[PDB]
Design a protein around this nucleic acid. Structure first.
Ligand SMILES: [Ca+2]
Ligand SMILES: [Ca+2]
Ligand SMILES: [Ca+2]
Ligand SMILES: [Ca+2]
Ligand SMILES: [Ca+2]
Ligand SMILES: [Ca+2]
Length: 76
DNA sequence: CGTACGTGCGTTTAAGCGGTGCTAGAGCTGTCTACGACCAATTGAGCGGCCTCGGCACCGGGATTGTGAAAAAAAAAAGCTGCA
């Protein structure tokens, strides 16, 4: 298997559609070829929690925990 | 009382001196990655409390033995001796 910032790239990159990108449609695609452990959902929200704050991923619209994201940082 | 160990002497030996040459290896740098801290999540091994019952303390008594101490027997010591 590959890492979870390896997995988060594959869903949003391949197709590009529902709610810009959001939490359910990412986890549906991700499970098909990561091969699911129980920790999948726990370390997929953690991967998002540190990727949104670093600059690799930037968020479109939300409040606190919920929302929707993109890949290209804002103004870049 | 006997001699082992200090003292002082001459003979012998090699430590110490410095110098020189040759180099193992101490020690430093740069490159990459396996590995350990450090997250959040799952969870069962070990914690505190508490209950039972057999190990062990305790007694006791009476037999045994190990451990002396006294008194009694042997040997040796000291004083006499007399003798070839
Ligand atoms: Ca579970
Ligand atoms: Ca206990
Ligand atoms: Ca209890
Ligand atoms: Ca018991
Ligand atoms: Ca018993
Ligand atoms: Ca007794």
């Amino acid at each position: 298997h590959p890492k979870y910032s390896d997995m988060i790239v594959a869903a949003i990159q391949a197709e590009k559609n529902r709610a810009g990108s959001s939490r359910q449609s990412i986890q549906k695609y991700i499970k098909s070829h990561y091969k699911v452990g129980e920790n999948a959902d726990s370390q997929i929200k953690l991967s998002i929690k540190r990727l949104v704050t670093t600059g690799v991923l930037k968020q479109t619209k939300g409040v606190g925990a919920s929302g929707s994201f993109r890949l290209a940082k804002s103004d870049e």
